[PDB]
């Protein structure tokens, strides 16, 4: 208003024309920057919605997506302009080394484990699973037979109990 | 990249800085945005590559069931601890005056040797420990056991692999040997990285060419206007030159932000493929290759990564 | 330079890490001009 | 060839900790034209660093520098090279299995923004 | 879409193009950006269908 009070209206538009343009460019820059931030904010919100749908309402099998290691559960908690997830995961702790073989030779027949790993402590042979150490005696029902005892590499002679 | 908001706009004249002080609050925001992009680009490679906190090394002998891995593991004979595939990629992918006008480039925090070590540790872990090292402590597993367990993950019984591992190893070796001449046959695919470089390289080139421009002024050169004109009328040329160069800077910064957004999106996708296709056997269709997916191997590249997806497909069919 | 960092950060206790200040801008020492030699020995001596 | 400009950065620990700082010049070569000296002069690829010493050890990175160089605070500021992690070699054999026996469970936190102020 | 910079900015007058030549190095940027969007939009149909 001091420009209007001091100057005379023909030189007013000479003076106050670039103020409007400068404030217009400032507004344009602010709007563009807000749109730029809002795009990636919406992308993060979409990722959060996906984690809401997958990690919370089910047990997702994607690696590293719903935590670190094998994922068990997740909890949501609200936050000011955001969300937080408490992922409950499971990891192994202690390990031991053992000797293996891809199959078991018995009566000229190859035997392959239906579900598990063939391991040995040095004397006896057992079958376990891949995330815990529970040995069991080799029996007919935990394995299956396909082929003979010459084609494969690494087989070892053993015995299989028949119930 | 980084820029100086005074050296670009003005030369060694204090009056240009004095007239720049009328605006003032622009290039502080420009520098803040530029250093934000710089620190984000430094951050981007970290979660893509540095995902294991325990660097491994390969055993000296290679009793890998007849599989040949010499093309992907680093070669100690070469002075640079890289792979022949990496050497081919470095050869197939191709300044001071740009550095001398107020625009500087900054070296990455991670050099090529450390990311090469990270990749070598990744292949070592995915070769000798299976996929258990992505969860907790690494557990060693012989390679045929791992191959059979990946065969078990696509509804195929494990006896097939132990029955035909010789043919499997021969097919793997032939397919690995084909990929060198497949890459060296045409430079088209590596263009997927070339557009990353030259579009950046021209980006300052169209900016540094904008210095010699009569943006409504008598001349683009600054000091001759001071030496020729009379100082109360020099401002009517100085201000329009300043505003034109400011508009050029604003356009360049905006375009850099636009490129950085999709670059970060692609980096996030690459990190996802590192997490799933490498450290595990993803069951998503077409995500980790074509057909049923078995494994994948990572290789570094100048400003990029390349995946080798090992997949399986049926060949012959009969009706019943 | 820690006081310059405080001045730039608009605070009294900076946290840690990399910060930014102005440039070096090494200055020129002197000025040298170069022009072609000889005035063709313009015959004002024969005039006078 | 015109005289090279600089770009000066400040290395500092916590203000609650101490007040000793270091000064880095980006791209400028010392090997040179840096007015005077200080405690020590280093010649990294990123630039010229003064006010700190270089060691032959290897530690993790807290304050990055560039080109695999990181600085930290010990009574003095020390710069060193990257240590990507603890060196490990896992034994491989034709018939060796590592089977786990015990296990733990754990909880992790993930912070995700949703929306900002209208 | 695709536009022509010279005809949109200036009509059928040569001196307006001469005054546009003072800026000179602007129109190619929007032309390249527009044809990049055009080729990307035509490209999307291949990997979606």
Curated annotation (Swiss-Prot), chain C:
Superkingdom per UniProt: Viruses
Disordered, as annotated region: 25-41
Glycosylation sites: 29, 31, 37
Phenotype for residue 37 to Q: Reduced viral infectivity
Biological role: Attaches the virion to the cell membrane by interacting with host receptor, initiating the infection. The major receptor is host ACE2. When S2/S2' has been cleaved, binding to the receptor triggers direct fusion at the cell membrane. When S2/S2' has not been cleaved, binding to the receptor results in internalization of the virus by endocytosis using host TFRC and GRM2 and leading to fusion of the virion membrane with the host endosomal membrane. Alternatively, may use NRP1/NRP2 and integrin as entry receptors.
Subunit (UniProt): Binds to host ACE2. RBD also interacts with the N-linked glycan on 'Asn-90' of ACE2. Cleavage of S generates a polybasic C-terminal sequence on S1 that binds to host Neuropilin-1 (NRP1) and Neuropilin-2 (NRP2) receptors. Interacts with host integrin alpha-5/beta-1 (ITGA5:ITGB1) and with ACE2 in complex with integrin alpha-5/beta-1 (ITGA5:ITGB1). May interact via cytoplasmic c-terminus with M protein. May interact (via N-terminus) with host bilirubin and biliverdin, thereby preventing antibody binding to the SARS-CoV-2 spike NTD via an allosteric mechanism.
Record-given protein name: Spike protein S1
Organism: Severe acute respiratory syndrome coronavirus 2 (2019-nCoV)
Record gene name: S
First and last residues shown, out of full length: 295 to 342 of 1273
